[PDB]
């Protein structure tokens, strides 16, 4: 039987990978980091409260100008916020109200969203007509589209619930690159700062590092015990952190190809919806199901602070590109800005 | 106050956007959200044409009441990752064929379509997001089941069934077996209706169940529930 021989070879390869990971690990991040000063207590106050959504807010994204926001809720409305003045720049009515992701273009020209309609809809913000119209609708996913991220005005990577990540060409609307290999539904997505690689967290308790220009998985990261719902690169692009339903955040390194540190507490038992990093990467912000965001010392696994003030589950997180503020969205139809 | 002309005009635009958002929310608050569920293509389509590829939107108005019925068919993924989106629906319309008690699902060996429907109903009814959400259970294809129960007994489906091979007793037994999967009888209600291929009164049953749910929500708002 060739199938049993190939299963034995796959088991041998997995054991070789595990042995190479074990032999390459000598001193953990705790053992080197325990000799530096902690960050103390990180206290943040709600500076703005963005009201106007009427259903559970499922996603958000910050602008690269660190002032403009976009948020998605089950109202069927994509509201673009001026976070400095608490002003609604745009309100985009959606064809499908079951939106679970939204992205904002780095140029600021476009907004994507997607959800249970299996379609990433690109919206042209800066039109000659003065309204926000659909640029195009990207179809081809057979499952719910769980995350989308703009590379530029013409390239976008969309995570989806068909156990498949996909890279699209917005000029043609065609499936440029298909990323396959995940067993469970892919729930999160995060682009590298140079947009050369990206990581995806799925429901197979695994994270995979893909290359955009070759379209095939480089490394696979395991260690979680439940469905990964959040993922985010470290700011230099050489590491990333995940968040799953087992109330643990794990930090993984691309070069070491290992898990470095678990950010978990005994008093936290609920799942993690959103994971975001600060500008320096020293603080890891994670949104949980117990209605608040916990700031973690990303180098020391210490609870640096708690961002409490949401009446329902914190579903989405976002730190501005200048690191000035963190914005938490939640199922109680509110967005809050913190400093 | 300490605002420019463009700042004041942007604030005015934001207030207009807030006004349109409030009107849209008030329009959507009077609509009835229904989640349509069932094990495969069993009776969803006949029910849909009786009132009227990702999620399917079905819009119909009955007695000056607008209904939003969502079909999550062909969403072949983990249900728990998107079933919390329908936490605030008015009721769940669960469609079950009565004639597939002896048919096989053909996806798994020795798998019954009826038992797959029981397992899906057990997962949906006792879900954490549907603790207080009522279920309008529809038992599809009663005439086909009535004419085929003479040829094939129900004991091949339920080994512990010892009643007569009649339509009424076995149909009541199937309804009781589906209602026994509700472990939250003190906080939710299951409405069961038997529907034929061409049955006119299906909408009225949905309207009555939705009206009971709306009465319960109204008493919840006034503190009587």
């Amino acid at each position, epitope marked *: 039987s060739e199938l049993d021989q190939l299963r034995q070879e796959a088991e041998q390869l997995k054991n070789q990978i595990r042995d190479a990971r074990k032999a390459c690990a000598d001193a953990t991040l705790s053992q080197i980091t325990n000799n530096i000063d902690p960050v103390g207590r990180i206290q943040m106050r709600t500076r703005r409260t963005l009201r106007g959504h009427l259903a559970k807010i499922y996603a958000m994204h910050w602008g690269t100008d660190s002032r403009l926001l976009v948020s998605a809720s089950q109202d069927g409305k994509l509201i673009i916020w001026d976070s400095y003045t608490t002003n609604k720049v745009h309100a985009i009515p959606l064809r499908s109200s079951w939106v679970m992701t939204c992205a904002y273009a780095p140029s600021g020209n476009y907004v994507a969203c997607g959800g249970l309609d299996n379609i990433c809809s690109i919206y042209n913000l800066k039109t000659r*007509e*003065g309204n926000v119209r659909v640029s195009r609708e990207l179809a081809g996913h057979t499952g719910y589209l769980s995350c989308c991220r703009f590379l530029d005005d013409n390239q976008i990577v969309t995570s989806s619930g068909d156990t498949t990540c996909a890279l699209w060409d917005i000029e043609t609307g065609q499936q440029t690159t298909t990323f396959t290999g995940h067993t469970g539904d892919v729930m999160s997505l995060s682009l590298a700062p140079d947009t050369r690689l990206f990581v995806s967290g799925a429901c197979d308790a695994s994270a995979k590092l893909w290359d955009v220009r070759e379209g095939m998985c480089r490394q696979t990261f395991t260690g979680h015990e439940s469905d990964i719902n959040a993922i985010c690169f470290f700011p230099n692009g050489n590491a990333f952190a995940t968040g799953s339903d087992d109330a643990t955040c794990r930090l993984f390194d691309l070069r070491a190809d290992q898990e470095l540190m678990t950010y978990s507490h005994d008093n936290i038992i609920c799942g993690i919806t959103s994971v975001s990093f600060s500008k320096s990467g020293r603080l890891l912000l994670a949104g949980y199901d117990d209605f608040n965001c916990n700031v973690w010392d990303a180098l020391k696994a210490d609870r640096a602070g708690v961002l409490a003030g949401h009446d329902n589950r914190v579903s989405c997180l976002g730190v501005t590109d200048d690191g000035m503020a963190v914005a938490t969205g939640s199922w109680d139809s509110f967005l809050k800005i913190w400093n | 106050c300490t605002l*420019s002309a*463009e*700042d004041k*005009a942007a604030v*005015e635009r934001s207030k*207009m956007i807030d006004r349109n958002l409030r009107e849209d929310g008030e329009k959507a608050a009077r609509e009835v959200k229904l989640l349509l569920l069932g094990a495969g293509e069993s009776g969803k389509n006949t029910i849909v044409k009786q009132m009227k590829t990702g999620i399917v939107e079905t819009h119909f108005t009955f007695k000056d009441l607008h209904f939003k019925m969502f079909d999550v068919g062909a969403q072949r993924s983990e249900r728990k990752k998107w079933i919390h989106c329908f936490e605030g629906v008015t009721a769940i319309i669960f469609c079950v064929a009565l004639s597939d008690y002896d048919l096989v699902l053909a996806e798994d060996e020795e798998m019954n379509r009826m038992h797959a429907s029981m397992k899906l109903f057990d997962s949906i009814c006792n879900n954490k997001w549907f603790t207080d959400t009522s279920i309008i259970l529809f038992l599809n294809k009663k005439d086909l089941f009535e004419e085929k129960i003479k040829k094939s007994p129900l004991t091949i489906c339920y080994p512990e069934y010892a009643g007569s091979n009649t339509y009424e007793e076995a149909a009541a037994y199937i309804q009781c077996q589906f209602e026994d999967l509700n472990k939250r009888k003190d906080t939710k209600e299951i409405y069961t209706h038997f529907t034929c291929s061409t049955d006119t009164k299906n909408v009225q049953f949905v309207f009555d169940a939705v009206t009971d749910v709306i009465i319960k929500n109204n008493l919840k708002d006034c503190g009587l529930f």
Partner: single-chain antibody
Amino acid sequence: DVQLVESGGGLVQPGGSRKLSCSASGFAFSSFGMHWVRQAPEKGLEWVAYISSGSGTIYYADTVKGRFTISRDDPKNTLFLQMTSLRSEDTAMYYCVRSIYYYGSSPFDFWGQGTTLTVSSGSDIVMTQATSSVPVTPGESVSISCRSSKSLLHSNGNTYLYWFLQRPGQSPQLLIYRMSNLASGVPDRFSGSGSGTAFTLTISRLEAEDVGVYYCMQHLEYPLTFGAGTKLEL
């Protein structure tokens, strides 16, 4: 495409009443604030009236306040200017101006073609342009300077200076909308700068397409005041 067409102009006796209509096509008329800007035969742009989106905020120039009436009807995409008691100084070519206001928006971007109307026989931010007519050789850089009595830099960091180019026999178009922000459809050789009350507009590698009259306008506080107008010849 976006178009604003004016109608209703003509020869009217002094003291009469005429109504100007502005039919809008190619854009969402309801979401745009709308302005009336007139140009007298002495070649000077003057703001007249402004109506916001939804008609919630209405402003008038101090010379036409209580004498003119601006209105819009968003179902038929028409902007109106009901004018009563017309005087001899109301003889001007009225332009219907399109403007939207959000963060990063570009108001005054599109202007209508303009209708010609003929009448027979203190606290405003005064803006002055030192050069009214200078010759320029094509292919060489030129700078147009503008000054304001009040500082146009607001506390939010925006300097509300607007640069307009009006070619001969053509409607004005927007080049710079907040003191540096290059507009859409205008080439990259137009660049604006300045700070406070001193301003300049640099046109490197000038061509015959850039020949016209340049106006600087503030949008800090109503009424909106235009510059005298700098014409580039040769």
